[PDB]
Design a protein around this ligand. Sequence first.
Ligand SMILES: Cn1c(=O)c2c(ncn2[C@H]2CN(C(=O)c3cccc(CN)c3)C[C@H](O)C[C@]2(C)O)n(C)c1=O
Ligand SMILES: C[S@@+](CC[C@H](N)C(=O)[O-])C[C@H]1O[C@@H](n2cnc3c(N)ncnc32)[C@H](O)[C@@H]1O
Ligand SMILES: [Cl-]
Ligand SMILES: [Cl-]
Ligand SMILES: [Cl-]
Ligand SMILES: [Zn+2]
Ligand SMILES: [Zn+2]
Lengths: 116, 301
Amino acid sequence: AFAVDAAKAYKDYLASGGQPITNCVKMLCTHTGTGQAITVTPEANMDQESFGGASCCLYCRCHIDHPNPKGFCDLKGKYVQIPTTCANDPVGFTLKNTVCTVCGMWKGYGCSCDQL
Amino acid sequence: SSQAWQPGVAMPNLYKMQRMLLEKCDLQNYGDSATLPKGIMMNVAKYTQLCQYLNTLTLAVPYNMRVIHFGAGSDKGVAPGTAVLRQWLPTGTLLVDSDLNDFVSDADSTLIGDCATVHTANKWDLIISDMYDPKTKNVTKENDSKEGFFTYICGFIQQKLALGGSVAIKITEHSWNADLYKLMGHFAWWTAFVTNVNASSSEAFLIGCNYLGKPREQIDGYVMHANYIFWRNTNPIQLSSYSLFDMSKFPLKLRGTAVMSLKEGQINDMILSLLSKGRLIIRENNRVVISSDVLVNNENL
Ligand SMILES: Cn1c(=O)c2c(ncn2[C@H]2CN(C(=O)c3cccc(CN)c3)C[C@H](O)C[C@]2(C)O)n(C)c1=O
Ligand SMILES: C[S@@+](CC[C@H](N)C(=O)[O-])C[C@H]1O[C@@H](n2cnc3c(N)ncnc32)[C@H](O)[C@@H]1O
Ligand SMILES: [Cl-]
Ligand SMILES: [Cl-]
Ligand SMILES: [Cl-]
Ligand SMILES: [Zn+2]
Ligand SMILES: [Zn+2]
């Protein structure tokens, strides 16, 4: 019945003023890509940075089990696009935000499915 | 110039043809650093320029390509180089990496331990190594051919590199091995490639392009390393990050290079010619299986 909650721990550490996890692997790319959130190759647009996925996953970086009951990682082996304004904390960003399953963009940072 | 807009500089053929004696490496821009794009790590830049140069060579690029990457962990616990290789390689490429210490990676599989503990059933289309021990940068002792992980790398190449495949192995003034230079002559072509972002270092990548499995040319590696140092000592390379800003042609092209299983008797000159041109890979196409030897000990008493 006891499971460590690292998501909450990082959120609380950030709220208390702790420095974001560093050394997320930022990629060189054209920055003319689709802007989708998580892709098989860097896809940053003009307003994003692309990073190697594993280096942006809290669970990978902390050496802890993934919440997936299969242990599968959403980011490992892929690239994540982070808004440039949030690129100082890619791990925080991926943790706190969710990807739209329809258009593949970050909800609130590119997803327009809920327009009209 | 123009060299400042390239990803780096390869050793000119004439320097490979010399018979120099080994000297100390003295680089005019030693200690200087290139201006990297904002927030970009040296190892991302370095691997990017390495891959940009590899794009200019005749690499075989088959479907279900297999690549292994040694020395893939950093002191930050991540794998910048692997992240660049995976970006460069076609989506779906099988990518394995390894290092002595634990690290998190984007590779399909990661083996932790001394490279000598790594075993694989299958053959590989491309081998990348950044293995390096900075304790070799000792100026007060003679600079002799090194063994250690270089002995492993030479055997791994002769045993597990597919015909047609290529390698890029990191060396420096003191981190080098004579047999590896000798093995360079078992490829259709070879060079020592210096990245423009790290031009102030004696680092180079020894690249062997299209493996032939036999000596095409006889190379004395003690001499060739001296030739490499002589080149570097007499040809300052201007630090440059220019090529990092143009990534439009970065992806390695999926050439669909043919893969065939073949036996030593069937390797004729036609085959050898196709291998030498980047148009054929020879190896089985079975499943890729790897393992890491683990030493078992009970310290209780
Ligand atoms: C280890 N090493 C070198 O040591 C070197 C070197 N190329 C030229 N040198 C120089 C370095 N020099 C320095 O002052 C110095 C020393 C340390 C750090 C820095 C940082 N600014 C500068 C000037 C010396 O008079 C000659 C000398 C020793 O050869 N290479 C490739 C190399 O690997
Ligand atoms: C320059 S670093 C790796 C940098 C890495 N490629 C990157 O992308 O940032 C050198 C690496 O070589 C590894 N390595 C060195 N010697 C090794 C050996 N005998 N066996 C296995 N790995 C080794 C070290 O652990 C060390 O991380
Ligand atoms: Cl951490
Ligand atoms: Cl020679
Ligand atoms: Cl064979
Ligand atoms: Zn993960
Ligand atoms: Zn959407």
